[PDB]
Amino acid sequence: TQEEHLKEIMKHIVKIEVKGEEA
Amino acid sequence: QSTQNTDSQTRTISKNTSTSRTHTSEVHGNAEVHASFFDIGGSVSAGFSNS
C-alpha cells in the first residue's frame, strides 16, 4: 500500500482547480 | 393691452419594442508557478471563448 500512499501524497501536491462562470 | 390665460392637458400614450444581437469573442491567458517543500511546478494556459 506504500505505492498507493505515494500516489495519494502526489494527488495532495496539487489543486482541484476553481469553479468560474463567464456567463 | 391684452392678457391671455391658457390651460392644456395632454395625454401621451407611447409604445416601444426592441431586439438586439451580440457576438462575443474572448482569448484568455494564464501562467502558474507552484512551490512546496520539495515539489515545484509551472503551468501555461490559454482559452478561446465565443459567445
Side-chain angles (χ1 to χ4, degrees):
Chain A
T1 302
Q2 186 288 141
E3 185 64 352
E4 181 60 1
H5 177 271
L6 183 172
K7 288 296 182 299
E8 184 60 359
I9 217 299
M10 180 60 60
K11 180 182 180 300
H12 190 276
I13 292 155
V14 263
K15 313 106 175 174
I16 217 295
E17 217 58 348
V18 296
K19 303 178 182 180
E21 61 179 0
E22 300 182 2
Chain B
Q1 64 184 358
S2 179
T3 60
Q4 182 177 2
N5 208 169
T6 302
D7 293 332
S8 296
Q9 296 175 358
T10 306
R11 296 181 179 89
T12 301
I13 300 169
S14 298
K15 184 66 180 297
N16 206 171
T17 192
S18 294
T19 63
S20 297
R21 288 180 63 192
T22 304
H23 290 85
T24 297
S25 69
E26 172 178 356
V27 176
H28 179 73
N30 190 1
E32 186 177 2
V33 176
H34 183 73
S36 173
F37 289 105
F38 295 100
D39 292 331
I40 299 169
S43 296
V44 173
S45 295
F48 173 71
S49 298
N50 191 1
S51 177

